[PDB]
Design a protein around this ligand. Structure first.
Ligand SMILES: [K+]
Ligand SMILES: [K+]
Ligand SMILES: [K+]
Ligand SMILES: [K+]
Ligand SMILES: [K+]
Ligand SMILES: [K+]
Ligand SMILES: [K+]
Ligand SMILES: [K+]
Ligand SMILES: [K+]
Ligand SMILES: [K+]
Ligand SMILES: [K+]
Ligand SMILES: [K+]
Ligand SMILES: [K+]
Ligand SMILES: [K+]
Ligand SMILES: [K+]
Ligand SMILES: [K+]
Ligand SMILES: [K+]
Ligand SMILES: [K+]
Ligand SMILES: [K+]
Ligand SMILES: [Mg+2]
Ligand SMILES: [Mg+2]
Ligand SMILES: [Mg+2]
Ligand SMILES: [Mg+2]
Ligand SMILES: [Mg+2]
Ligand SMILES: [Mg+2]
Ligand SMILES: [Mg+2]
Ligand SMILES: [Mg+2]
Ligand SMILES: [Mg+2]
Ligand SMILES: [Mg+2]
Ligand SMILES: [Mg+2]
Ligand SMILES: [Mg+2]
Ligand SMILES: [Mg+2]
Ligand SMILES: [Mg+2]
Ligand SMILES: [Mg+2]
Ligand SMILES: [Mg+2]
Ligand SMILES: [Mg+2]
Ligand SMILES: [Mg+2]
Ligand SMILES: [Mg+2]
Ligand SMILES: [Mg+2]
Ligand SMILES: [Mg+2]
Ligand SMILES: [Mg+2]
Ligand SMILES: [Mg+2]
Ligand SMILES: [Mg+2]
Ligand SMILES: [Mg+2]
Ligand SMILES: [Mg+2]
Ligand SMILES: [Zn+2]
Lengths: 48, 57, 74, 134
RNA sequence: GUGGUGGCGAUAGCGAGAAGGAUACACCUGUUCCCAUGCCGAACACAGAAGUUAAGCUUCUUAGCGCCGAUUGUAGUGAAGGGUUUCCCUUUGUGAGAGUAGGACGUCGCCACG
RNA sequence: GCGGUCGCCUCCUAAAAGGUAACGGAGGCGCCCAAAGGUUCCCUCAGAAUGGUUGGAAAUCAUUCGAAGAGUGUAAAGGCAGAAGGGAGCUUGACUGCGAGACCUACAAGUCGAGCAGGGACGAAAGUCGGGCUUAGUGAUCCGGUGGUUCCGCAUGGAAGGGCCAUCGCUCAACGGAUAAAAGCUACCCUGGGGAUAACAGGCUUAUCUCCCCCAAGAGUCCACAUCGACGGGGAGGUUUGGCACCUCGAUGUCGGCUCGUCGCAUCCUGGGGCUGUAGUCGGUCCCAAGGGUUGGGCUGUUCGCCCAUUAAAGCGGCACGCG
RNA sequence: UGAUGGAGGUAGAGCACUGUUUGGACUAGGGGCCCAUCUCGGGUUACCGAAUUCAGAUAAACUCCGAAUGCCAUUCAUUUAUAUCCGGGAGUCAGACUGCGAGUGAUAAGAUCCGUAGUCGAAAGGGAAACAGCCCAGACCACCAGCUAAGGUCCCAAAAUA
């Protein structure tokens, strides 16, 4: 089962990126290092 | 040197390129004549519409 | 049952050899690399060949059995 | 005669112009039957010609059938209006263009060869002539 | 002459055979070293110079394979026409593929050591 | 009408730029991958031969040959062995703000894009990275949800409610989406139009149909051709079943029968003749021949057909399947 | 229009790949069949025969090749005189036939659907007897003038009984 997800910056809680993931292959909430335009620096973004 | 080209055939029922070639040479009505330099371009135009014109020196 | 088809993609060459083109002009649309990008020519994400700089377009042969596009500024 | 398989069930009728691309000369046999016109030839016609030729030869000698009915042709049943897709495959033909050597024969005296080829030609739909191996 | 490094469509190739290591390149000796094998110092990496042209390597011979390929002729075809007009033919221009004469066992550069 | 189809991608049709239709010939899509993305480094396949326990055609192993005959998530085409195929390490560029200039294009959209800035991944560096070998994997607006917001806030401060940015809710699949919401009968029917479009007849075509032929395997005790004539081939006719939709829908009356006929000959009788598997009487087949003739009933609306009884014969067809 | 440079895979051709395919050589293997079985160890059909090889074909969805044309472009050359852009006003969205290149059809249709050129549509005139679409040819008018195109010249009926 593949579904679209939103990645939110853990620092400013800004819903920054849109992506998708296969729930079966990645049961746990995805986490990436992505640029946060509000803070203008790379930060940890976690799926909500 | 020179070429006297005279239109001996009508342009009705002819391809657009042949009609345009006649126009470019500057011929109008049938039996209309013109004089042009004997360049390669002019000779090529004459060859393109050779079946419609008669050419003299 | 038949009767389906996809819109034509208007592939092929978009600039003649010896023509002057501005930077970023598309030189060739293709699926895969039917022609390779030469000097000052980039290849897009979908194998489209475009000019990186202003200049005259030239289609050459890359070796024995491959073609190539280059853009030469004046 | 029918191909064991075909890449495509249905195929264009095509166009027959000019001489045959190849096979215009007798290759294996001593005598050959050359078509002087272009026309489709059905597997039924090939078989009829083959039977006539072989039976007159008394099943002696050897016979080669150079042509093969690669192409398929379809048709529409009576009472069917135009459209609604192409018709179902009906028969098999070989497009034969003038100059093609349809049949060859060997191992038989010349009179027998000529007579057998004459019978086969009358079965076929094209005008033909007899040719000897060079 | 050898070793690096390139340009040019293999006419640079492949196959077969012959010669050489003076130098150089190589095989070649080991794993202590940085480094490594989804196991193996075979490879990669490192240290060294006991032996060999055996191999690679370079030079040479060869047209067997591959490659390049003229002319002539023909198919096709633009234009102008004709016919008994699915097709076929005529004039003029263009002109292949195939087949063949033949070419070709490379040439044009830079650098270091001789 | 029924069946099929409706949007997107690939090929052929497509006539060597591009584009190009048919209820033309073939297939796919409504996804998938947290690596199957990025980068650095490294590697080269499929099959075959030979040898080798289980092990057999074919499991794994070794040498040689082997230029791609493999693989490339997924259809096909194009491309890729300087890899885009395969393995490993580290990573998240599957980045944010954009974007000269192009392609495509009625619009709406769609496609490519160097390059600049910010902050990064990998790499020593060069440099590469704005997803994946490329081309499908998608849906306008309105309306609503969620988050952010130095925007507005109907006297003023708030509030309510809006705006802007982000993103979600479409088999709106009839896929440029009529409405949030919708199936049928009409022979009781009616109106506006069309021969733009069917049913009758005409026209074109002749696959089919009828008729006539070619070749001659066989049948005919022998003997292809008295007679019949396979497998095949070629024509004529425009009476059949059909195809097309060209005249007629501000009307061309549609079966059969009756009245009246007329015409074609591919001749049913009568007339002439050839061949005969023609002893004679009968015949069979073919040729010439259209002058005349070519029926009365039972059944059925019938044509047709069967039957009854006759006749020299009880012809086949055209004439708007002649003639309201 | 010529010159030059290009991109592309059609006609044709070809078998280098992929399908289809004929014959020959050989044979794995398969079928029968015997002996001998432990189906097992052989000897056979000129039985069917893969793969290889020799020869020979074939293709819209095959290509080692590959035109003629058409197309793109050139501060190019000759001739010619239109092209863009901005705005006002439209009509058109039933096309027909002929030639050529294809599809559908039956390699039928005055059929249907495209590409291409012409004519009709919106074009009178001459020829094809009559005959929108064919051939020649584009009517601003007057002439009881002349030369020709397609097509024609014995009479209807102009011109050769050349
Ligand atoms: K015949
Ligand atoms: K070593
Ligand atoms: K050596
Ligand atoms: K060589
Ligand atoms: K990786
Ligand atoms: K709709
Ligand atoms: K009723
Ligand atoms: K009628
Ligand atoms: K007929
Ligand atoms: K006949
Ligand atoms: K007899
Ligand atoms: K009517
Ligand atoms: K009658
Ligand atoms: K008689
Ligand atoms: K009569
Ligand atoms: K009655
Ligand atoms: K009446
Ligand atoms: K082809
Ligand atoms: K046309
Ligand atoms: Mg397409
Ligand atoms: Mg991409
Ligand atoms: Mg050649
Ligand atoms: Mg074209
Ligand atoms: Mg094209
Ligand atoms: Mg990949
Ligand atoms: Mg207030
Ligand atoms: Mg729609
Ligand atoms: Mg009632
Ligand atoms: Mg009414
Ligand atoms: Mg009508
Ligand atoms: Mg009528
Ligand atoms: Mg019509
Ligand atoms: Mg009236
Ligand atoms: Mg008669
Ligand atoms: Mg009674
Ligand atoms: Mg009637
Ligand atoms: Mg009446
Ligand atoms: Mg061809
Ligand atoms: Mg029509
Ligand atoms: Mg009109
Ligand atoms: Mg007229
Ligand atoms: Mg009129
Ligand atoms: Mg005028
Ligand atoms: Mg005169
Ligand atoms: Mg007279
Ligand atoms: Zn943040």
């Amino acid at each position: 089962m593949r579904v679209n997800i939103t990645l939110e910056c853990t620092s400013c809680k800004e819903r920054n990126y849109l992506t998708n993931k296969n729930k079966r292959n990645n049961p746990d909430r995805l986490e990436k290092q992505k640029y946060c335009p509000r803070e203008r620096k790379v930060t940890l973004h976690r799926e909500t | 040197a020179e070429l006297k080209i005279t239109l001996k055939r009508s342009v009705i029922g002819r391809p657009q390129n042949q009609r345009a070639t006649v126009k470019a040479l500057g011929l109008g009505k049938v039996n209309s004549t013109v004089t042009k330099p004997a360049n390669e371009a002019i000779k090529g135009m004459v060859n393109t519409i050779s079946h419609l014109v008669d050419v003299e020196e | 049952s038949n009767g389906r088809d996809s819109e034509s993609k208007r592939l092929g060459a978009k600039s003649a050899d010896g023509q002057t083109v501005t930077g970023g002009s598309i030189l060739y649309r293709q699926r895969g690399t039917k022609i390779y990008p030469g000097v000052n020519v980039g290849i897009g994400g979908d194998d489209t060949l475009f000019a990186k700089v202003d200049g005259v377009v030239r289609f050459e042969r890359k070796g024995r059995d491959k073609k190539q596009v280059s853009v030469y500024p004046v | 005669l029918v191909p064991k398989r075909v890449k495509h069930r249905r195929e264009f009728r095509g166009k027959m112009r000019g001489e045959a691309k190849g096979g215009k000369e007798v290759a294996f046999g001593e005598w050959g039957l050359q078509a002087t016109e272009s026309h489709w030839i059905t597997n039924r016609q090939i078989e009829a010609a083959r039977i006539a030729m072989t039976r007159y030869m008394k099943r002696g000698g050897k016979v080669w059938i150079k042509i093969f009915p690669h192409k398929s042709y379809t048709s529409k049943a009576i009472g069917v209006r135009m459209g609604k897709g192409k018709g179902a495959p009906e028969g098999w033909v070989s497009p034969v263009k003038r100059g093609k050597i349809m049949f060859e024969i060997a191992g038989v005296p010349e009179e027998v060869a000529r007579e057998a080829l004459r019978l086969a030609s009358h079965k076929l739909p094209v005008k033909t002539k007899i040719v000897k191996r060079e």
